[PDB]
Design a protein around this nucleic acid. Structure first.
Lengths: 48, 49, 64
RNA sequence: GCGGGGGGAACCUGGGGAACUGAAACAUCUCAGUACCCAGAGGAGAGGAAAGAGAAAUCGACUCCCUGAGUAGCGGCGAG
RNA sequence: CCCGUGGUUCGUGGAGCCAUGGGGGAAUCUGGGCGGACCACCGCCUAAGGCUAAGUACUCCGGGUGACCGAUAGCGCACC
RNA sequence: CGGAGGCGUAGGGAAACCGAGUCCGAACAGGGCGCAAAGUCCGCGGCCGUGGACCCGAAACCGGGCGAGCUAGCCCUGGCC
RNA sequence: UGAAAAGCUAACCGAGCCCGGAGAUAGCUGGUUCUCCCCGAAAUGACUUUAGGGUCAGCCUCAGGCGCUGACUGGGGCCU
RNA sequence: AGUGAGGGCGCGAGCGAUAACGUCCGCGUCCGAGCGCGGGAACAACCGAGACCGCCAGCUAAGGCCCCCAAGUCUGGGCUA
RNA sequence: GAAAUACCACCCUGGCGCGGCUGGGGGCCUAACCCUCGGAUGGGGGGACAGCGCUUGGCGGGCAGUUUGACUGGGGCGGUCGCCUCCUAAAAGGUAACGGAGGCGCCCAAAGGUCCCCUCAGGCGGGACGGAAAUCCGCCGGAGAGCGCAAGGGUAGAAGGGGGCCUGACUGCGAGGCCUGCAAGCCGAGCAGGGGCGAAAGCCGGGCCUAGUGAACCGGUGGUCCCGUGUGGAAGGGCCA
């Protein structure tokens, strides 16, 4: 019951611009190092 | 198909607006008016088959 | 073993906010006939009907 | 002077290959390359060193397990 | 490479690669298919021969274990 | 003990993306929010989806075989009226 | 096959019999099992190749929270 | 989670012949699904009445009291025969 | 004269010249192929045909596999199946019935805007071409004539009759409500851009309103200028109209 406007065509290989929601709040509230953390150091980080 | 055929308005190459219309009485005669999103309002014209 | 949404559904609009809801193009009428015209064409935001949109939901649950 | 042939519960490769039921009808579709007829190598064959992957100036035989998403997608884009 | 078809998550599609039934019909490493229908790029691999081990399958047959069965359940079949 | 993962951990959009903001948009007007009000895992259990899924129940369709001492036919060959 | 009615085709072939898909399919009928305790359904709506079926609406039950909000009654507007 | 069809009675319109234990809709009750007791002879839905279980207890509905069967063959005043 | 004439330029028409492309058809062979010979691997008849391989278009029950609706005081044949209006809905609203009735599946380019004016049929009385009924005069009138189209509502304190000027029958949108379980369909102040009718107090996001209507898929066109399966583009494709 309804046309549509979302079409995901004949394929399988998309690009990227990595949208991982991370929070300066978890960070500074209590799990960080106020200057250098980097994606690399975020394991524990609940944003990966 | 009856004296009722559907046309629509387009404006001086800077847009096109729509709406149906007819055929009967003054047939073709088709300037009209209307305003596109071109500029802020603007003539438009109409015609367009 | 895994069910997986009326993929179809997920596809044909059919969208969810993990909050607890979904929507489809207003889809009230539009993008079809319409020797309609204007003001009428005012209906293309988005929409959602409650109650019913459960089946939708659990069919989907797993991805979309 | 050799060889085969003849078997064999199931597994196995290729050969050829179907309606139901679903799609609450049903003709694309579906079950499916599934059931079954066959030929044949085994003790297991199958595949097995890349005109591959994949895009990072990267990997590196083939096979099987977990994951890869049931997403990427295939479609009277419907059952599936 | 033209159409006639198989594969493949592809059911006809902008639909690629391998694969063949018809007609055409060649290149030796400036070679030639492959990433993007296709065109200009870079990149990739080296095709149209050959051999086999090892890790998943299978259960005739043997051994063993069973919040698996007791004679109308268990294999139907515990014994000419 | 094995730490490829999948679920959380903002999301808003067809996307480009932006980002707790956001798409429409030239519109300061609405809808997805923001709002954590943490889930995530193990179990036990009401419960669907696929699998025959309370149980036995049909006309029949399809595959491979089984039979002319079944029966009718036709062939060969004696006999009897 | 068939001096053909739809005949006979291992004792009832209008499309044989055994095994197989398969435990086909079955909105239709049957059948649907210890005790006791609470509540208490509807047997109507809406569109449906549905119409003895079904999706959503109406009524029910168990759990959270609101917690004086309810049928009905008094009274006073403004509706028939 | 279950019914997705049901009937009866009263009133109000259809219809039908203003016929039917007909069928259409609505207000109510109903009966199923409790509606198992009284009851009217006995009778799912007509008047009474809600049965958690006892009583060799008493008051009552409806509707009853010559008898068959609990209860005045009461009293009072008539009118039919 | 519409043109001017030599001799040198290019370019055409041509019914005929010639040349490259290719379409149509008529003749014994011949060696593949077929039948072949008649007692031999050599002869004979046919032979570029049709046999035959593949692709082409078309006849085509002979065959196959499906389907050929629901309602309805049985089935079928008959009716009928979407929407508006009136009755019965019994006075809120709101409900069957093979219950009564009766319309629509158009359009109106200007019946779409606004400013300015006007104001019925019909009764009567008097009148040229009349002449039951035009056209004009004279009175009278809960407005019963009127409003494309059916009914019903409304309603000339006109939505109705006439003139002027004009496009909003605008995009962006809407708060908050009608009804409805679904989706529907429907009502709308006000903010923005932008105009149009008056000088303006303001009306205009189609009509006087209740019927002229159709999901979803699929695909088209006018965008856009979002995506592109290494990158540039592109087949192709996402949202708008």
């Amino acid at each position: 019951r309804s046309t549509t406007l979302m079409r995901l065509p004949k394929r399988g290989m998309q690009g990227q611009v990595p949208g991982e929601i991370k929070r300066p709040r978890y960070q500074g509230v209590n799990l960080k190092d106020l200057a250098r953390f980097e994606g690399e150091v975020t394991p524990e980080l609940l944003v990966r | 198909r009856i004296k009722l055929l559907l046309e629509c308005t387009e404006c001086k190459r800077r847009n096109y607006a729509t709406e149906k219309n007819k055929r009967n009485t003054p047939n073709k005669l088709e300037l009209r008016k209307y305003c596109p999103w071109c500029r802020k309002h603007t003539v438009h014209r109409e015609v367009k088959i | 073993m895994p069910k997986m949404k009326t993929h179809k559904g997920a596809k044909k609009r059919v969208k969810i906010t993990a909050s607890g809801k979904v929507v489809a193009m207003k889809t009230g009428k539009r993008h079809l006939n319409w020797q309609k015209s204007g003001k009428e064409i005012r209906q293309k935001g988005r929409k959602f009907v409650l109650a019913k949109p459960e089946a939708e939901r659990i069919k989907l649950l797993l991805p979309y």
